[PDB]
Amino acid sequence: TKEQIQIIKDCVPILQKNGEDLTNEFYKIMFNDYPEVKPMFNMEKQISGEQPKALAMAILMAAKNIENLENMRSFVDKVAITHVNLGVKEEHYPIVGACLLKAIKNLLNPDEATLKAWEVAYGKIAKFYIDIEKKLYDK
Ligand code: HEM
Ligand SMILES: [C-]#N
């Protein structure tokens, strides 16, 4: 519980320094393996680096608040509008997780404890987004 939290915090600086590189790799993997999701995204925003930076910043936001995701509620609330408007479903979250974890393995080449810590954190972060979005879809 505590060791895993610290590993996620330790990764904040890594993401501050090369987060965009991680997310560039994430979108490469996802668009290659799951081309069906590509049209949901604006390619202009990929080419400019804006969306890679935005995702990296959202991951940073989650890592910073990993002990209490409620402290990113006002942030996630806003991202949820984009996701719901574009038809992001609960079932897309495992796709993102698989591609993100692979990107992490590729670029950070972490130890198993770090990989495990991100697998766990992602599940929690995804659940936070899913639950807010579910309300939007149903409310
Ligand atoms: C926990 C995982 C995720 C995080 C942290 C995340 C974060 C973000 C952020 C910060 C944005 C920028 C838009 C805004 O701020 O309103 C965004 C946009 C978007 N997200 Fe996600 N997202 C996640 C999962 C997903 C999933 C599962 C999908 C489904 C394919 C997805 C599809 C999109 C699309 C299509 C956009 C619009 C991008 C564009 O305008 O080009 N995201 N996401
Ligand atoms: C969302 N990327």
Short mmCIF file of N, CA and C and ligand atoms in Angstrom, two decimals:
data_model
loop_
_atom_site.label_atom_id
_atom_site.label_comp_id
_atom_site.label_asym_id
_atom_site.label_seq_id
_atom_site.Cartn_x
_atom_site.Cartn_y
_atom_site.Cartn_z
N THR A 1 0.84 -1.24 0.00
CA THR A 1 0.00 0.00 0.00
C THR A 1 0.87 1.28 0.00
N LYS A 2 1.74 1.45 1.00
CA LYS A 2 2.67 2.59 1.12
C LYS A 2 3.84 2.59 0.12
N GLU A 3 4.44 1.42 -0.10
CA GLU A 3 5.54 1.32 -1.05
C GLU A 3 5.03 1.66 -2.45
N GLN A 4 3.86 1.14 -2.81
CA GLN A 4 3.25 1.41 -4.12
C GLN A 4 2.90 2.89 -4.32
N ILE A 5 2.39 3.53 -3.28
CA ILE A 5 2.10 4.96 -3.36
C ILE A 5 3.37 5.72 -3.66
N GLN A 6 4.44 5.40 -2.94
CA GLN A 6 5.69 6.11 -3.14
C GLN A 6 6.26 5.90 -4.53
N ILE A 7 6.13 4.69 -5.08
CA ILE A 7 6.59 4.44 -6.43
C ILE A 7 5.85 5.35 -7.40
N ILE A 8 4.53 5.46 -7.26
CA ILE A 8 3.79 6.35 -8.14
C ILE A 8 4.27 7.79 -7.98
N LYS A 9 4.46 8.27 -6.75
CA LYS A 9 5.00 9.62 -6.55
C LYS A 9 6.38 9.77 -7.18
N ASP A 10 7.22 8.76 -7.09
CA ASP A 10 8.57 8.79 -7.63
C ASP A 10 8.52 8.97 -9.14
N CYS A 11 7.42 8.56 -9.74
CA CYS A 11 7.26 8.66 -11.18
C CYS A 11 6.80 10.02 -11.65
N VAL A 12 6.31 10.87 -10.73
CA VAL A 12 5.93 12.24 -11.11
C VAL A 12 7.06 12.98 -11.89
N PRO A 13 8.25 13.06 -11.34
CA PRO A 13 9.34 13.73 -12.07
C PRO A 13 9.66 13.12 -13.42
N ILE A 14 9.53 11.80 -13.52
CA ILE A 14 9.81 11.13 -14.77
C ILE A 14 8.83 11.58 -15.82
N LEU A 15 7.58 11.71 -15.41
CA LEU A 15 6.53 12.17 -16.28
C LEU A 15 6.65 13.68 -16.56
N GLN A 16 7.12 14.44 -15.58
CA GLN A 16 7.35 15.87 -15.82
C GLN A 16 8.39 16.04 -16.93
N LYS A 17 9.39 15.16 -16.96
CA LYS A 17 10.49 15.30 -17.88
C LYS A 17 10.25 14.68 -19.23
N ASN A 18 9.58 13.53 -19.26
CA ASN A 18 9.40 12.85 -20.53
C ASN A 18 7.99 12.32 -20.73
N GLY A 19 7.03 12.90 -20.03
CA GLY A 19 5.66 12.44 -20.14
C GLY A 19 5.12 12.47 -21.54
N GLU A 20 5.44 13.51 -22.31
CA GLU A 20 4.99 13.61 -23.68
C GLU A 20 5.57 12.50 -24.53
N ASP A 21 6.80 12.10 -24.23
CA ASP A 21 7.38 10.99 -24.95
C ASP A 21 6.62 9.68 -24.64
N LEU A 22 6.25 9.50 -23.38
CA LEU A 22 5.46 8.34 -22.98
C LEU A 22 4.12 8.35 -23.72
N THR A 23 3.45 9.51 -23.77
CA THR A 23 2.15 9.51 -24.40
C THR A 23 2.25 9.44 -25.91
N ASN A 24 3.31 9.97 -26.50
CA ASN A 24 3.51 9.75 -27.92
C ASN A 24 3.56 8.25 -28.20
N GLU A 25 4.28 7.50 -27.36
CA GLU A 25 4.37 6.04 -27.51
C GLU A 25 3.01 5.37 -27.28
N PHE A 26 2.28 5.82 -26.28
CA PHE A 26 0.93 5.32 -26.03
C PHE A 26 0.04 5.49 -27.26
N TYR A 27 -0.01 6.68 -27.88
CA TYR A 27 -0.87 6.84 -29.03
C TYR A 27 -0.40 6.04 -30.24
N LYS A 28 0.91 5.90 -30.41
CA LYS A 28 1.44 5.02 -31.47
C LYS A 28 0.91 3.59 -31.29
N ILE A 29 1.04 3.06 -30.09
CA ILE A 29 0.59 1.70 -29.79
C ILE A 29 -0.92 1.59 -29.98
N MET A 30 -1.67 2.51 -29.41
CA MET A 30 -3.09 2.40 -29.47
C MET A 30 -3.64 2.53 -30.88
N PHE A 31 -3.13 3.49 -31.66
CA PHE A 31 -3.62 3.67 -33.02
C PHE A 31 -3.22 2.49 -33.91
N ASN A 32 -2.10 1.87 -33.61
CA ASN A 32 -1.67 0.69 -34.37
C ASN A 32 -2.46 -0.55 -34.05
N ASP A 33 -2.73 -0.78 -32.75
CA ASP A 33 -3.36 -2.02 -32.29
C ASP A 33 -4.87 -1.92 -32.31
N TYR A 34 -5.37 -0.69 -32.15
CA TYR A 34 -6.81 -0.42 -32.06
C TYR A 34 -7.18 0.75 -32.99
N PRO A 35 -6.94 0.56 -34.28
CA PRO A 35 -7.15 1.64 -35.24
C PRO A 35 -8.59 2.16 -35.23
N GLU A 36 -9.53 1.34 -34.79
CA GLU A 36 -10.91 1.72 -34.74
C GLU A 36 -11.15 2.92 -33.83
N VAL A 37 -10.28 3.16 -32.85
CA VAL A 37 -10.49 4.32 -31.98
C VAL A 37 -9.90 5.60 -32.56
N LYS A 38 -9.02 5.50 -33.56
CA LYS A 38 -8.34 6.69 -34.04
C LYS A 38 -9.26 7.86 -34.45
N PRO A 39 -10.32 7.61 -35.22
CA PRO A 39 -11.19 8.73 -35.64
C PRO A 39 -11.88 9.49 -34.51
N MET A 40 -11.89 8.93 -33.31
CA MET A 40 -12.44 9.64 -32.16
C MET A 40 -11.56 10.86 -31.82
N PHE A 41 -10.28 10.75 -32.12
CA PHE A 41 -9.30 11.78 -31.80
C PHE A 41 -9.09 12.73 -32.96
N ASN A 42 -8.69 13.95 -32.62
CA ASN A 42 -8.36 14.93 -33.63
C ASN A 42 -6.88 14.81 -33.98
N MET A 43 -6.57 14.40 -35.20
CA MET A 43 -5.16 14.25 -35.55
C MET A 43 -4.35 15.54 -35.53
N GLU A 44 -5.00 16.67 -35.74
CA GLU A 44 -4.29 17.93 -35.67
C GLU A 44 -3.72 18.09 -34.28
N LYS A 45 -4.49 17.63 -33.29
CA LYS A 45 -4.08 17.75 -31.87
C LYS A 45 -2.97 16.75 -31.53
N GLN A 46 -2.82 15.72 -32.37
CA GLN A 46 -1.73 14.77 -32.18
C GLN A 46 -0.47 15.39 -32.77
N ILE A 47 -0.59 15.91 -33.99
CA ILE A 47 0.56 16.47 -34.67
C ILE A 47 1.16 17.68 -33.93
N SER A 48 0.31 18.50 -33.32
CA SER A 48 0.80 19.70 -32.63
C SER A 48 1.44 19.36 -31.30
N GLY A 49 1.21 18.13 -30.81
CA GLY A 49 1.68 17.73 -29.49
C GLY A 49 0.72 18.08 -28.37
N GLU A 50 -0.37 18.76 -28.72
CA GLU A 50 -1.31 19.22 -27.68
C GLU A 50 -1.98 18.07 -26.93
N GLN A 51 -2.46 17.07 -27.65
CA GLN A 51 -3.11 15.96 -26.95
C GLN A 51 -2.12 15.06 -26.18
N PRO A 52 -0.99 14.71 -26.77
CA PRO A 52 0.03 14.03 -25.97
C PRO A 52 0.37 14.78 -24.70
N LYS A 53 0.48 16.09 -24.76
CA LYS A 53 0.80 16.84 -23.56
C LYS A 53 -0.38 16.80 -22.58
N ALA A 54 -1.60 16.91 -23.11
CA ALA A 54 -2.76 16.91 -22.26
C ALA A 54 -2.88 15.59 -21.49
N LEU A 55 -2.66 14.46 -22.17
CA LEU A 55 -2.74 13.17 -21.52
C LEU A 55 -1.67 13.04 -20.47
N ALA A 56 -0.46 13.45 -20.81
CA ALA A 56 0.62 13.37 -19.86
C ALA A 56 0.28 14.17 -18.59
N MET A 57 -0.29 15.34 -18.78
CA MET A 57 -0.66 16.17 -17.67
C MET A 57 -1.77 15.59 -16.83
N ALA A 58 -2.69 14.89 -17.48
CA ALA A 58 -3.74 14.19 -16.73
C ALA A 58 -3.17 13.01 -15.93
N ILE A 59 -2.20 12.29 -16.51
CA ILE A 59 -1.56 11.21 -15.78
C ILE A 59 -0.82 11.79 -14.59
N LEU A 60 -0.10 12.89 -14.80
CA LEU A 60 0.56 13.56 -13.68
C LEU A 60 -0.43 13.93 -12.60
N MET A 61 -1.57 14.47 -13.01
CA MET A 61 -2.60 14.87 -12.07
C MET A 61 -3.04 13.68 -11.23
N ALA A 62 -3.19 12.53 -11.88
CA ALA A 62 -3.63 11.34 -11.16
C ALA A 62 -2.52 10.83 -10.21
N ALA A 63 -1.30 10.80 -10.71
CA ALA A 63 -0.18 10.32 -9.88
C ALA A 63 -0.02 11.21 -8.64
N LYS A 64 -0.13 12.52 -8.82
CA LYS A 64 -0.06 13.44 -7.69
C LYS A 64 -1.13 13.19 -6.66
N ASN A 65 -2.29 12.74 -7.11
CA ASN A 65 -3.43 12.55 -6.22
C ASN A 65 -3.77 11.09 -6.00
N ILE A 66 -2.79 10.22 -6.23
CA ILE A 66 -3.12 8.79 -6.20
C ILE A 66 -3.68 8.26 -4.86
N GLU A 67 -3.32 8.90 -3.75
CA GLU A 67 -3.84 8.51 -2.43
C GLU A 67 -5.27 8.97 -2.22
N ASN A 68 -5.71 9.97 -2.98
CA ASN A 68 -7.08 10.47 -2.84
C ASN A 68 -7.52 11.12 -4.14
N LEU A 69 -8.10 10.31 -5.03
CA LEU A 69 -8.47 10.79 -6.35
C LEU A 69 -9.57 11.85 -6.32
N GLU A 70 -10.27 11.99 -5.20
CA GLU A 70 -11.27 13.04 -5.08
C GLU A 70 -10.65 14.40 -5.27
N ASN A 71 -9.35 14.54 -4.98
CA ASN A 71 -8.66 15.83 -5.12
C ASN A 71 -8.33 16.16 -6.54
N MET A 72 -8.82 15.36 -7.49
CA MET A 72 -8.76 15.77 -8.89
C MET A 72 -10.14 15.78 -9.51
N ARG A 73 -11.18 15.79 -8.67
CA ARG A 73 -12.54 15.76 -9.19
C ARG A 73 -12.86 16.92 -10.15
N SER A 74 -12.54 18.15 -9.73
CA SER A 74 -12.87 19.29 -10.61
C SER A 74 -12.14 19.20 -11.96
N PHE A 75 -11.02 18.48 -12.01
CA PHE A 75 -10.28 18.30 -13.25
C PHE A 75 -10.98 17.23 -14.10
N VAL A 76 -11.23 16.09 -13.49
CA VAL A 76 -11.78 14.97 -14.22
C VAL A 76 -13.18 15.26 -14.74
N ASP A 77 -13.94 16.01 -13.96
CA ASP A 77 -15.29 16.45 -14.37
C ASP A 77 -15.30 17.06 -15.73
N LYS A 78 -14.25 17.80 -16.02
CA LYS A 78 -14.16 18.50 -17.29
C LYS A 78 -13.72 17.58 -18.40
N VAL A 79 -12.77 16.70 -18.11
CA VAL A 79 -12.33 15.75 -19.13
C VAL A 79 -13.52 14.83 -19.50
N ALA A 80 -14.33 14.46 -18.51
CA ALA A 80 -15.49 13.60 -18.75
C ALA A 80 -16.41 14.14 -19.83
N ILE A 81 -16.49 15.47 -19.98
CA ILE A 81 -17.37 16.03 -20.99
C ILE A 81 -16.87 15.64 -22.37
N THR A 82 -15.57 15.71 -22.56
CA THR A 82 -15.01 15.33 -23.85
C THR A 82 -15.23 13.85 -24.12
N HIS A 83 -14.93 13.04 -23.13
CA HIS A 83 -15.07 11.60 -23.27
C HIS A 83 -16.51 11.18 -23.58
N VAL A 84 -17.46 11.67 -22.78
CA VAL A 84 -18.86 11.31 -23.04
C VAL A 84 -19.32 11.81 -24.41
N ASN A 85 -18.99 13.06 -24.75
CA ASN A 85 -19.37 13.57 -26.06
C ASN A 85 -18.81 12.74 -27.24
N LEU A 86 -17.65 12.13 -27.05
CA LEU A 86 -17.04 11.34 -28.12
C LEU A 86 -17.34 9.84 -28.05
N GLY A 87 -18.17 9.45 -27.10
CA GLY A 87 -18.60 8.06 -26.98
C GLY A 87 -17.59 7.13 -26.36
N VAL A 88 -16.75 7.65 -25.48
CA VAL A 88 -15.85 6.82 -24.70
C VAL A 88 -16.71 5.99 -23.75
N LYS A 89 -16.53 4.68 -23.80
CA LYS A 89 -17.27 3.77 -22.95
C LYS A 89 -16.40 3.11 -21.92
N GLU A 90 -17.05 2.54 -20.89
CA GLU A 90 -16.34 1.78 -19.88
C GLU A 90 -15.41 0.78 -20.52
N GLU A 91 -15.88 0.12 -21.58
CA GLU A 91 -15.11 -0.93 -22.21
C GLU A 91 -13.89 -0.46 -22.98
N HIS A 92 -13.73 0.86 -23.17
CA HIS A 92 -12.50 1.35 -23.82
C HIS A 92 -11.38 1.47 -22.82
N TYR A 93 -11.70 1.59 -21.54
CA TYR A 93 -10.67 1.79 -20.53
C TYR A 93 -9.64 0.64 -20.46
N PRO A 94 -10.03 -0.65 -20.56
CA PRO A 94 -9.01 -1.70 -20.62
C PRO A 94 -8.06 -1.59 -21.85
N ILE A 95 -8.54 -1.00 -22.95
CA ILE A 95 -7.69 -0.80 -24.12
C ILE A 95 -6.62 0.22 -23.79
N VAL A 96 -7.05 1.35 -23.26
CA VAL A 96 -6.12 2.39 -22.83
C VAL A 96 -5.12 1.85 -21.82
N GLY A 97 -5.59 1.06 -20.85
CA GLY A 97 -4.67 0.54 -19.86
C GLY A 97 -3.61 -0.38 -20.47
N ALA A 98 -4.03 -1.25 -21.38
CA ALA A 98 -3.08 -2.15 -22.00
C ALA A 98 -2.03 -1.35 -22.79
N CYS A 99 -2.47 -0.32 -23.51
CA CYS A 99 -1.55 0.43 -24.33
C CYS A 99 -0.65 1.32 -23.46
N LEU A 100 -1.21 1.89 -22.40
CA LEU A 100 -0.40 2.70 -21.51
C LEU A 100 0.66 1.87 -20.78
N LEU A 101 0.28 0.71 -20.27
CA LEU A 101 1.24 -0.14 -19.59
C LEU A 101 2.35 -0.60 -20.53
N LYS A 102 1.99 -0.88 -21.78
CA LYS A 102 2.99 -1.24 -22.75
C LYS A 102 3.95 -0.08 -23.04
N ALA A 103 3.40 1.12 -23.16
CA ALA A 103 4.21 2.31 -23.40
C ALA A 103 5.20 2.49 -22.25
N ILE A 104 4.72 2.26 -21.03
CA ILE A 104 5.56 2.38 -19.85
C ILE A 104 6.70 1.35 -19.87
N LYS A 105 6.35 0.12 -20.18
CA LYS A 105 7.36 -0.92 -20.31
C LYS A 105 8.39 -0.55 -21.37
N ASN A 106 7.92 -0.05 -22.51
CA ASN A 106 8.82 0.30 -23.63
C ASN A 106 9.77 1.42 -23.31
N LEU A 107 9.24 2.50 -22.73
CA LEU A 107 10.06 3.68 -22.56
C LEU A 107 10.74 3.80 -21.22
N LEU A 108 10.08 3.40 -20.13
CA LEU A 108 10.67 3.53 -18.80
C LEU A 108 11.48 2.32 -18.41
N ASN A 109 11.20 1.19 -19.07
CA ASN A 109 11.85 -0.08 -18.77
C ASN A 109 11.96 -0.27 -17.25
N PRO A 110 10.83 -0.20 -16.57
CA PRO A 110 10.80 -0.28 -15.11
C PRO A 110 10.96 -1.69 -14.55
N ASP A 111 11.14 -1.75 -13.24
CA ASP A 111 11.19 -3.03 -12.55
C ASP A 111 9.77 -3.53 -12.36
N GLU A 112 9.61 -4.76 -11.87
CA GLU A 112 8.30 -5.34 -11.77
C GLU A 112 7.47 -4.63 -10.75
N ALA A 113 8.09 -4.17 -9.65
CA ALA A 113 7.34 -3.47 -8.64
C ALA A 113 6.71 -2.21 -9.23
N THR A 114 7.46 -1.53 -10.09
CA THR A 114 6.95 -0.29 -10.70
C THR A 114 5.82 -0.60 -11.68
N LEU A 115 6.03 -1.63 -12.49
CA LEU A 115 4.97 -2.04 -13.40
C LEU A 115 3.69 -2.40 -12.64
N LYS A 116 3.83 -3.21 -11.59
CA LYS A 116 2.70 -3.60 -10.75
C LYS A 116 2.00 -2.37 -10.16
N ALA A 117 2.81 -1.41 -9.72
CA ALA A 117 2.25 -0.25 -9.09
C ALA A 117 1.40 0.52 -10.12
N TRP A 118 1.87 0.60 -11.37
CA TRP A 118 1.10 1.31 -12.41
C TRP A 118 -0.13 0.53 -12.85
N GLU A 119 -0.03 -0.80 -12.82
CA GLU A 119 -1.20 -1.62 -13.17
C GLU A 119 -2.31 -1.34 -12.15
N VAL A 120 -1.94 -1.35 -10.88
CA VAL A 120 -2.89 -1.07 -9.81
C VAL A 120 -3.45 0.37 -9.88
N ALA A 121 -2.55 1.33 -10.02
CA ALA A 121 -2.96 2.73 -10.08
C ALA A 121 -3.88 2.95 -11.25
N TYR A 122 -3.54 2.41 -12.41
CA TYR A 122 -4.40 2.62 -13.57
C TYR A 122 -5.82 2.10 -13.31
N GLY A 123 -5.93 0.92 -12.69
CA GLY A 123 -7.24 0.44 -12.41
C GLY A 123 -8.04 1.43 -11.59
N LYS A 124 -7.39 2.03 -10.60
CA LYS A 124 -8.08 2.97 -9.74
C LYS A 124 -8.45 4.27 -10.46
N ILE A 125 -7.55 4.77 -11.29
CA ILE A 125 -7.74 6.01 -12.03
C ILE A 125 -8.86 5.81 -13.03
N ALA A 126 -8.83 4.68 -13.72
CA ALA A 126 -9.86 4.36 -14.68
C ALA A 126 -11.22 4.32 -14.02
N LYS A 127 -11.31 3.67 -12.86
CA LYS A 127 -12.57 3.58 -12.16
C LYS A 127 -13.12 4.97 -11.82
N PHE A 128 -12.24 5.87 -11.38
CA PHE A 128 -12.66 7.23 -11.07
C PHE A 128 -13.27 7.94 -12.29
N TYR A 129 -12.63 7.83 -13.45
CA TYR A 129 -13.16 8.42 -14.67
C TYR A 129 -14.46 7.74 -15.10
N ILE A 130 -14.46 6.40 -15.10
CA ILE A 130 -15.64 5.63 -15.51
C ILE A 130 -16.87 6.01 -14.69
N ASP A 131 -16.70 6.13 -13.39
CA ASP A 131 -17.85 6.40 -12.52
C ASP A 131 -18.44 7.78 -12.76
N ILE A 132 -17.59 8.77 -12.99
CA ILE A 132 -18.05 10.12 -13.28
C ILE A 132 -18.77 10.14 -14.64
N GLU A 133 -18.17 9.47 -15.63
CA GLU A 133 -18.74 9.39 -16.95
C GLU A 133 -20.06 8.61 -16.98
N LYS A 134 -20.14 7.54 -16.19
CA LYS A 134 -21.37 6.76 -16.11
C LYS A 134 -22.51 7.66 -15.68
N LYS A 135 -22.26 8.50 -14.67
CA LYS A 135 -23.26 9.45 -14.22
C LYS A 135 -23.66 10.38 -15.35
N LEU A 136 -22.69 10.86 -16.13
CA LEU A 136 -23.03 11.74 -17.24
C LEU A 136 -23.91 11.06 -18.26
N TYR A 137 -23.59 9.82 -18.57
CA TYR A 137 -24.39 9.08 -19.53
C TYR A 137 -25.80 8.82 -19.00
N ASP A 138 -25.93 8.60 -17.70
CA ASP A 138 -27.22 8.24 -17.11
C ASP A 138 -27.95 9.41 -16.44
N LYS A 139 -27.27 10.52 -16.20
CA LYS A 139 -27.91 11.61 -15.47
C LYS A 139 -28.51 12.64 -16.43
C1 HEM B 1 -7.72 7.26 -17.30
C2 HEM B 1 -7.58 7.28 -18.62
C3 HEM B 1 -7.73 8.56 -19.44
C4 HEM B 1 -7.23 9.79 -19.20
C5 HEM B 1 -6.36 10.23 -18.04
C6 HEM B 1 -7.61 10.62 -20.29
C7 HEM B 1 -7.33 11.96 -20.40
C8 HEM B 1 -7.77 12.77 -21.44
C9 HEM B 1 -7.55 14.20 -21.50
C10 HEM B 1 -6.83 15.08 -20.46
C11 HEM B 1 -8.13 14.61 -22.64
C12 HEM B 1 -8.18 16.06 -23.18
C13 HEM B 1 -9.61 16.59 -23.23
C14 HEM B 1 -10.11 17.38 -22.06
O1 HEM B 1 -9.28 17.83 -21.22
O2 HEM B 1 -11.37 17.61 -22.01
C15 HEM B 1 -8.71 13.49 -23.31
C16 HEM B 1 -9.32 13.48 -24.51
C17 HEM B 1 -9.79 12.44 -25.22
N1 HEM B 1 -9.80 11.14 -24.75
FE1 HEM B 1 -9.07 10.50 -22.96
N2 HEM B 1 -8.35 9.87 -21.18
C18 HEM B 1 -8.42 8.59 -20.68
C19 HEM B 1 -9.08 7.54 -21.25
C20 HEM B 1 -9.67 7.52 -22.49
C21 HEM B 1 -10.34 6.45 -23.13
C22 HEM B 1 -10.65 5.09 -22.47
C23 HEM B 1 -10.69 6.85 -24.33
C24 HEM B 1 -11.44 6.03 -25.37
C25 HEM B 1 -10.87 5.79 -26.55
C26 HEM B 1 -10.23 8.20 -24.54
C27 HEM B 1 -10.49 8.95 -25.67
C28 HEM B 1 -10.30 10.32 -25.73
C29 HEM B 1 -10.61 11.08 -26.88
C30 HEM B 1 -11.19 10.55 -28.17
C31 HEM B 1 -10.27 12.49 -26.56
C32 HEM B 1 -10.37 13.71 -27.45
C33 HEM B 1 -8.97 14.09 -27.92
C34 HEM B 1 -8.94 15.08 -29.05
O3 HEM B 1 -9.67 16.10 -28.95
O4 HEM B 1 -8.17 14.83 -29.99
N3 HEM B 1 -9.61 8.59 -23.37
N4 HEM B 1 -8.48 12.35 -22.57
C1 LIG B 2 -7.34 10.16 -23.92
N1 LIG B 2 -6.35 10.06 -24.48
#
